[PDB]
Amino acid sequence: DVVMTQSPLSLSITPGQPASISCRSIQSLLDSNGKTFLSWYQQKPGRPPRRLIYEVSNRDSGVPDRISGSGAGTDFTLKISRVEAEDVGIYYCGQDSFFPFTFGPGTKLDIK
Amino acid sequence: EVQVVESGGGLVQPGGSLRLSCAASGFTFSHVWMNWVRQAPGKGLEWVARIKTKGGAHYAASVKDRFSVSRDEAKNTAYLQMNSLKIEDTAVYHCKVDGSIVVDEGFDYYIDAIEKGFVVWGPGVQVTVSS
């Protein structure tokens, strides 16, 4: 299976500054044709997860634009210009490039 | 907005078996492919199986010779069946599916478009392998 690692395990910042998180994979996720299926998921406490970014950088309708991501090859990360109260929740990284799917252990993002 | 329906939940004894199910409605869904992932208690998610309902199947590491899957189109649902449960199987099941809702169905050959659907997430089954 294509296992992947997340970083940082835990994080917590006060509103007013940007934030970032990264999730690396064991090997390149690019398939034969060239497309990528890197997905970013957010799961607030008490409710199921919700996606924010698709194919490394694209944004899903309903997601705030302040959320953006990029990457290439094996290194990928998410960048947010401003964190709000609604952003509090559990953050996940995911990829479906290969049949055996793997999801990160999960990172905590607390706000004062 | 697209919706998902979770069914087939219940309590199973160690090494027993049960029947799982899920459904979706509210749109056409076009080329939609259902998934199955569970979150262990206190640990991250983990893939279970796969069913390409509309349009090929894929099974995880610890589900061979234990889970058999099926698809539906009249209802767009999928029929899952497991056997030989274990203590590690105790986890919340979420109906994962890659949504692709079509939009403005092309009435000619100059208007075809697709909404680029969303990955619907199921509420949760909370399957426990105990008495």
Add this chain to the structure above:
Amino acid sequence: LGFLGAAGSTMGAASMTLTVQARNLLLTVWGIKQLQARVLAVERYLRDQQLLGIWGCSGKLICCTNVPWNSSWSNRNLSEIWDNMTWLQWDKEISNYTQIIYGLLEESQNQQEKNEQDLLALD
């Protein structure tokens, strides 16, 4: 009088109104239809005066020939035919002998042309 002004009258008098009849002888789909009718009438008029030309009465309405009349065709008296019978009934009476008359007329005309040519050759 006019066209067919004496068609039903006696044949003798009706024979004097032949000039009126003689004078009366003359998108893409509609165009071809009109052209078809016109050429049909013209072709019929050429066939007619061609039948007159092959005989000894070219360019003439009333005309007699040298073919003797046969009683088999009709043995009626000369008084009623020229004063009682009409052209319609008379034509219907010899509707089957029309071809024989034309053939005999043609043969007689050809013989007459050959005879006059030979006569004028030595004259």
Add this chain to the structure above:
Amino acid sequence: LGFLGAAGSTMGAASMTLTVQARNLLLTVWGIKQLQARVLAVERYLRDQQLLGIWGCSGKLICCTNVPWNSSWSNRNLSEIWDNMTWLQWDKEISNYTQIIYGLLEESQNQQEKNEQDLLALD
């Protein structure tokens, strides 16, 4: 001389130059209009031939009838009409009564034809 070359000349030249004129009388859109024009010319020629034939002058360039002349139609001497007049002026002057001459010629032709038929019948 060429065709229509005697239009303005004296009657003498025109009277002796009628043979040339007589001989001169005779993508799908092009074919349709050309066929229409050809049929029109043919119909005109047949009409002229019929008019000449009804007057007992078929196939004759010049033909004389037994219809006396009228002073009303022309109140001028014959000499100038022939050696001092063109066909255009003559037709322009006779156009007033050109329609009635045909009827008189037709009547005279029919009368003489019937008389000839009767004469041949008696003999």
Add this chain to the structure above:
Amino acid sequence: LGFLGAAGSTMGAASMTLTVQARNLLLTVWGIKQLQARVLAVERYLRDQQLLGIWGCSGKLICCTNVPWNSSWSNRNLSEIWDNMTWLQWDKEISNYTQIIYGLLEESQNQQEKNEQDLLALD
């Protein structure tokens, strides 16, 4: 005999069956073709009839004229021409001057008509 039966026979015997030959002279894809063919045939017939009329025949199948036969056109006497010679090679013989012959005929007929009119006018 049938149509064209005397084609190979001598002209003397073939002249006895000239009338049959003279008589035989008479959705859109086929319609246009048929109309064109009919119009062409009618035009040809009118042209031939016009030539005969202008030459003085005016319908007479066997008609002669007053134009001497120049020896330059052919140095063959009437002996073998009317005994065994057919019409094919004969046509070929005069095929070099038929135009001159036609021209002479015309002028001769025009002069004859003018002289006839003058003579009839004197008396």
Add this chain to the structure above:
Amino acid sequence: NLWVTVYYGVPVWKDAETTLFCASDHNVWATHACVPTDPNPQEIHLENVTEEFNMWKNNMVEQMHTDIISLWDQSLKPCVKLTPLCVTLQCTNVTNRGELKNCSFNMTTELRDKKQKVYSLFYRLDVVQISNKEYRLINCNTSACTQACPKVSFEPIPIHYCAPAGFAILKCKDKKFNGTGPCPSVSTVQCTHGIKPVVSTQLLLNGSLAEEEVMIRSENITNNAKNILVQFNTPVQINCTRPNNNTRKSIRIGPGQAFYATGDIIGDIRQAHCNVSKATWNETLGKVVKQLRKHFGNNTIIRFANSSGGDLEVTTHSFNCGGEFFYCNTSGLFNSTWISDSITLPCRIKQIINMWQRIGQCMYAPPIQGVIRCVSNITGLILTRDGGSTNSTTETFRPGGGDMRDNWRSELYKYKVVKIEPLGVAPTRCKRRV
């Protein structure tokens, strides 16, 4: 002795057929093809002449029908077609009968890369269920219909038929002509009188009245399948009009192409109908039955019944005026029995119509602004005889249809084309000299 004589221009004719050319004075019935007619009628009476007439085997109706079909096609072809209109329709019931359906559907606009949502009203007879909400235009599963081209109209202009040179037309001037029989009084005319090409079924409108009494025509009354034609001796006024005046909307389906749809209705919706004087209709039926008794005998019971069954074209009465095509239920005019102040007939409207019952040649009729009134009078009928094996003394008749030729056969029966035979021969004591 005697000798045969050749006579040219003899007045002899025989039965034959030929292609007659049209002739008349913004109408599908007349164009540049028809040449002008002679104002002076060149009619010549024929004394001592008697010729047999057969209006059933005559080829006049065949040639007329063929030329009219060609004219109809040549008239509908020059402009826009409605092939893209075959799409799904979303309709909702109207609310100030209960027939008109407010349908809406997607349709392209000036640019082939864009769409414009439009709505129009269509009658129930012009649509069919796919479900209760979805609808599809009728005849879409057979062919593509064509809209009545707006420049031309359906005014029945009179048409005069004239035979070409060499042919002649005989007119039966004698009265009491029963269709198939000798006509002692005959007349010849190079051009027939005015003929109305008005299209209709069951009843004959804007026709020619009889001479002095009601007429009855049929191949031979001793039959059932063959239709029977009846001509009235007096005119019967009839009125028809729809109070609803539709609103035309200009919708463009392509470059230089646009169809006129039915807009919203103004006022109240009322079903179309027709009116006829009851007294005049009763008198006409009385005269018709009186004449029928001559052939069927006296003390007989004559009854009238509506159409038995079939499509709407044969089971209803059609009209042609102002661009609107009607289909009325005339069951009220054939619901009387005989021994020894107005009538109203319900009617319906239909746009898609198979005029000449030709499968795959449907035509779309666009509406017309303002109310439309068509004043006219009936002149004849097309009934069908039914009954048993003479077990009862009651005769029943029903209106007919379908045979479009029978509609116009009641007008051309007064003419017959013949071929002249100017060549003739006779005997005389004349011999040609040398």
Add this chain to the structure above:
Amino acid sequence: NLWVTVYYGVPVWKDAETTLFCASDHNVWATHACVPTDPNPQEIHLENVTEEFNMWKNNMVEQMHTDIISLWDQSLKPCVKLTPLCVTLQCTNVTDMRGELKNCSFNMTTELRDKKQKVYSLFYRLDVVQINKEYRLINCNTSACTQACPKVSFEPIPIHYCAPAGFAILKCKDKKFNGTGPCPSVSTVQCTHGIKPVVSTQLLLNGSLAEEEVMIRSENITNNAKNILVQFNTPVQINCTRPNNNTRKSIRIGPGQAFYATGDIIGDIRQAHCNVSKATWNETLGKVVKQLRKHFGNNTIIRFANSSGGDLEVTTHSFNCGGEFFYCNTSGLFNSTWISDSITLPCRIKQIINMWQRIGQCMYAPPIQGVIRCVSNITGLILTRDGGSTNSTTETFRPGGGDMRDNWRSELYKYKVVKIEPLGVAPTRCKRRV
């Protein structure tokens, strides 16, 4: 006494219309369609004869017009239709002393219906309008145009009209012909001479030159609404060219049909124009004003201004050269006043044309590779006189933009069709012998 006679083949003619036909020696006007004209036409000159001519009411011009538009439609029928070209066009500018040319792009189909392709093409501002950056084609809301096929060319092959048997064409060879009235010197020809069906407004290209000097012909000199024709006795050479080297690229619009679009422009971009020497034009205008004074009297000054106003085609000189339809502003030439180096004409190109001033048959001429450069002969003008008041001791003239009837009439002014009447009657001292 005197007796009448009948003469056959007499020389007589009368005014009457007839169905004329062509005669000639990959083109709109098919040369093979016309019957092969006589290589050496026989022109017979008459004597002692006069005839009246009316070049205004003449029917040959009407026949020419009908035939030209009929052939135009016939030639455009087989070419492909541009119905799918109506699509939204996101367009920008081109980067020149002009910005009119536009570089537009748009989605479009390919050989496969399901598949689609993105292509670009250059278009002029004269046939492009903003739908709201977004542009479209003006022809979309009028009718679908049909691009002229590359095989068919607009070259003006001369056509020799000819009359059928029984008719004759009278040619008026009299010099300084007044246009309408008796012609003391006439002639008869079997078929007309070479006539080039060149289409042009205001200025006449490749026309016929006069005999003695500049002639003036008009229906009524005293009438201002009616146009006034002019014909020069000497030719005024005009050079028109397109310095832009165009590139043609084929695009598969559909199965078996290709679309010819303007590839691109290589090198510098310059405006199209025409050149005419001012000395020759000055002399020609001097002679023209002298001839005008001959009719308007002495001591009268004349002015020459630009077009009064109206559409582009009617207010500008329009002509074709190698397939490209030009539209030049002739205001500079018609700018002078008469009392008692070469000029450059700013010209623009238009790809969408509506020839014959009729809607529903628009054209989309394709581009031509290389540099277009053609020479032409200016032989006539189409002037228009504005309303005056007591003549104001001066008259103003403008270049009229009438239809092509005047253009074709300027060449057929010396022709007329008549019908022969070989039937005649005259008296003679003769008596038909019995």
Add this chain to the structure above:
Amino acid sequence: NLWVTVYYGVPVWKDAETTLFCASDHNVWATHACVPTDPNPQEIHLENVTEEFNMWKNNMVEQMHTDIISLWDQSLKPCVKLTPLCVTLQCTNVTDMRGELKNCSFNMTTELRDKKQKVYSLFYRLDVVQINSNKEYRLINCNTSACTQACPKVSFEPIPIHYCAPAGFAILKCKDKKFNGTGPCPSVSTVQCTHGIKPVVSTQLLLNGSLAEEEVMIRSENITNNAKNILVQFNTPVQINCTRPNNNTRKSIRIGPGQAFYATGDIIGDIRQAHCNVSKATWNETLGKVVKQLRKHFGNNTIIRFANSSGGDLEVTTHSFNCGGEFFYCNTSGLFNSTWISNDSITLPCRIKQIINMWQRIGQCMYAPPIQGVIRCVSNITGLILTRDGGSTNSTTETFRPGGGDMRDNWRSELYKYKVVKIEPLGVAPTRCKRRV
């Protein structure tokens, strides 16, 4: 002292160009409009008449070619065009020892323009091309031209057609036996209408054609020239039996509002290669007679060899047929595989192709729909179209191969017995005549 005389209606004819009209007793040629011909085709002999016939330069062949093309284009005009058939086709092999038939699935419109419909149809390999176990394919006619389909209501039976000359013209029939192409016919006759000529369609061979009355004949402008085809006529026809036991299923699909399309459904039973049979002994005897005549023309002690086609397009290098609705294409290499010096049957493999361009034109093809049940195409060969190579200086041995390329040769083999002549009934001759005033 001879005087010229004018005669009319004399027998004189000259060769000239003219137009003819149809005549016979629905079909693509629409014989219903042909004027009916009399039931007695009267024929008149011409004793002592000899005329020169040049069938190679005859104009009736061009007239027939143009007329047939016009009828073919007119009959297919009202039929439903298949412009929307050009779409992306996803085909797969049909499961059976050919690997040629493909099962294609594609999208199509229906009665309503706002909704599509998924359907499938079998297409032969010759009707599809690769455009880069399933792949995308495209029809060969998409990048060339979108043509219509032959309406099933119309048939392709080669019914005979009679050509009758118009008024003022005549047709001369050369009945002389052993009469080659160009030469004087010792015995000629005249007929108002030609015999029933079947406008058959074939390549490299003649089917249902005229048969020689005496023996096999060879016709050509000059056999020495290799640029001229060689026409052969057999005095004894050889039977040929073609068929395809497949039992194709017809699938009716309404592509539009009234536009019906006939697709190829699933095959019933087992798929068998389309082949044709012909007797071997008869073919050997016919070849023997042909080589005998060829030796007589080229000289004695000459080696004659028969080889297959020299390559080219499938239309010219194969054998074209017209029966059942579709057009077969057989590989005739099995016949011209022998050399001549001094119960058995042969099987000819054949293929199937729906889209055709038999007229060799560019821009107008034809879609032939299939038919139900087995097809039994029974016919008999009557002629051959052979071509010979230069051979260099080597003249002791010659090789002949099937020709093709000019469709006029098919009908030319049937029109060699007729010619068109313009009647000239005007003549002048001298006589002792003198008119009397």
